[PDB]
Amino acid sequence: CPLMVKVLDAVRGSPAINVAVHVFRKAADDTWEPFASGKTSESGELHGLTTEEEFVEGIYKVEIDTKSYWKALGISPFHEHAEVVFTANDSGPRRYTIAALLSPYSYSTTAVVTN
Amino acid sequence: PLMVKVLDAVRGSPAINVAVHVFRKAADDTWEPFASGKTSESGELHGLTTEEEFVEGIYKVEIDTKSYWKALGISPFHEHAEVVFTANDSGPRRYTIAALLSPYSYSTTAVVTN
Amino acid sequence: PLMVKVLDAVRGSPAINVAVHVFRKAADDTWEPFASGKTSESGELHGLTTEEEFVEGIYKVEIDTKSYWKALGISPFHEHAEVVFTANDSGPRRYTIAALLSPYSYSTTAVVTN
Amino acid sequence: CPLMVKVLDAVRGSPAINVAVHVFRKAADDTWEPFASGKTSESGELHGLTTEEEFVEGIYKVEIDTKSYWKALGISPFHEHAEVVFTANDSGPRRYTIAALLSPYSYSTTAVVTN
Numbered sequence: 001c002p003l004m005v006k007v008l009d010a011v012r013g014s015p016a017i018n019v020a021v022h023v024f025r026k027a028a029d030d031t032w033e034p035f036a037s038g039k040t041s042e043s044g045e046l047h048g049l050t051t052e053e054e055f056v057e058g059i060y061k062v063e064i065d066t067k068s069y070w071k072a073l074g075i076s077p078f079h080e081h082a083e084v085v086f087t088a089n090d091s092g093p094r095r096y097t098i099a100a101l102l103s104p105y106s107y108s109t110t111a112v113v114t115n
Numbered sequence: 116p117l118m119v120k121v122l123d124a125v126r127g128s129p130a131i132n133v134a135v136h137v138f139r140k141a142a143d144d145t146w147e148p149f150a151s152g153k154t155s156e157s158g159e160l161h162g163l164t165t166e167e168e169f170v171e172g173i174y175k176v177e178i179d180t181k182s183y184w185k186a187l188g189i190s191p192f193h194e195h196a197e198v199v200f201t202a203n204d205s206g207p208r209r210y211t212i213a214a215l216l217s218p219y220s221y222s223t224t225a226v227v228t229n
Numbered sequence: 230p231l232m233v234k235v236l237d238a239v240r241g242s243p244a245i246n247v248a249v250h251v252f253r254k255a256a257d258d259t260w261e262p263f264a265s266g267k268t269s270e271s272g273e274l275h276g277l278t279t280e281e282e283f284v285e286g287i288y289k290v291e292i293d294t295k296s297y298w299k300a301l302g303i304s305p306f307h308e309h310a311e312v313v314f315t316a317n318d319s320g321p322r323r324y325t326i327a328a329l330l331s332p333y334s335y336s337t338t339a340v341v342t343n
Numbered sequence: 344c345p346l347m348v349k350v351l352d353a354v355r356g357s358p359a360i361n362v363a364v365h366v367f368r369k370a371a372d373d374t375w376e377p378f379a380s381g382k383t384s385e386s387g388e389l390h391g392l393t394t395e396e397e398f399v400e401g402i403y404k405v406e407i408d409t410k411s412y413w414k415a416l417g418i419s420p421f422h423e424h425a426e427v428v429f430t431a432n433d434s435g436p437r438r439y440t441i442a443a444l445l446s447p448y449s450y451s452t453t454a455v456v457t458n
């Protein structure tokens with residue numbers, strides 16, 4: 001699988017477990033089409049979202065449902081969700097990890113792209 | 116009531132001339148254009164909106180990070196940063212949306228004051 | 230020439246009353262006390278030093294994050310944040326050391342201007 | 344092993360490989376005593392630093408040699424190193440991951456503490 005998502009919780013110092021994640025691919029008419037989705041595991045990771053054959057070049061959006069995550073923990077959040085928008089580009093063999101570190105009023109995201 | 120500040124984590128400097136587009140969710144659930152501007156030499160974008168215009172709603176602040184890096188000769192990973200939040204639900208607040216940029220990573224924080 | 234700004238990522242607010250201790254590496258390779266202060270209501274700490282006092286050197290800015298969280302009733306992970314850098318090596322610069330705090334995580338950024 | 348270190352590079356979007364990491368434990372006289380050290384692997388991870396028997400409660404410092412990392416990549420850095428200082432506390436079974444995300448003028452660090 002060429003696309004994985006990993007989510008951490010900066011308040012509790014833990015993987016962010018059971019977070020809903022939706023991936024969209026930008027269509028020709030500029031709308032966002034559902035592409036893959038799931039919930040993070042007990043390790044905060046979401047594997048198996050797509051396959052090499054399905055994951056073609058294009059613009060993708062990863063939407064992480066942070067508001068529901070914080071609400072399930074009883075913590076007051078700022079954002080509706082965290083959004084990560086990027087172009088997939090075929091520069092030799094590549095695997096993409098979209099990582100996010102969550103706080104109630106802040107988040108960070110990094111792309112780890114490896115061969 | 117809405118200010119945006121952007122920093123560059125490679126240079127340790129304000130991120131100057133970053134385009135920012137703000138949208139507000141309309142009644143038909145689409146993103147309507149709300150305001151736009153660019154960061155100044157200090158990395159700050161003031162004057163996007165007014166107290167009258169900045170009503171309750173769900174807002175999206177799109178920070179055009181790819182255009183920023185490309186103008187510096189760098190090919191970055193992300194298209195833009197997208198900060199989405201419900202504003203003013205318990206009355207007017209002042210929002211500072213801050214972003215810290217690297218070519219393959221960014222962080223964003225909200226400072227909300229009364 | 231040296232300012233420290235601290236934000237709280239749980240509240241989306243300035244981190245107020247954060248103690249900050251600055252040290253400078255002495256000729257015997259030990260950390261000598263250089264300056265200290267606390268962040269104001271804006272989360273900013275001004276007036277730590279002067280242009281005359283802030284000579285070249287290796288400086289350590291210790292931000293007392295554990296004391297901050299404990300005063301808010303929270304048990305955090307880190308003892309403090311420690312920002313270590315060589316200053317003024319190519320002439321005087323102005324340094325802003327920023328920190329963004331959560332109970333189990335923090336980030337720190339330097340904004341350096343001439 | 345109860346203590347692992349993971350380092351990512353925010354400029355290149357990659358694990359931070361071959362980064363020197365030194366762990367110290369605070370001694371009774373308030374000095375920092377060497378405790379463990381190593382270099383991150385091709386995955387940006389440093390495993391096997393210590394054992395359950397050696398890793399007692401106390402105050403620890405993890406020093407990540409970021410300046411040498413950036414210099415090996417030809418990139419101008421701000422910090423001498425990144426320093427992570429924390430108390431280890433025996434609250435049931437615990438494993439500690441100290442994660443760091445590096446940029447030339449900024450770094451972030453998070454603690455992932457799991458059972």
Ligand SMILES: O=C(O)c1cc(Cl)c2c(c1)C(=O)c1ccccc1C2=O
Nearest residue numbers: 120121122213214215327328329336
């Ligand atoms: O108050 C500000 O002018 C301000 C603006 C930004 Cl953009 C940042 C900060 C402050 C800040 O403390 C900060 C701290 C740690 C990581 C990123 C940032 C920022 O990115």
Ligand SMILES: O=C(O)c1cc(Cl)c2c(c1)C(=O)c1ccccc1C2=O
Nearest residue numbers: 099100101108349350351442443444
């Ligand atoms: O799971 C990991 O091995 C791992 C290591 C690091 Cl170092 C990071 C992350 C994950 C991660 O999700 C992450 C998310 C947002 C900002 C920084 C990081 C990291 O810096």
Ligand SMILES: [Ca+2]
Nearest residue numbers: 057089090091
């Ligand atoms: Ca291509």
Ligand SMILES: [Ca+2]
Nearest residue numbers: 171203204205
């Ligand atoms: Ca309302």
Ligand SMILES: [Ca+2]
Nearest residue numbers: 285317318319
């Ligand atoms: Ca010099």
Ligand SMILES: [Ca+2]
Nearest residue numbers: 400432433434
């Ligand atoms: Ca104990």
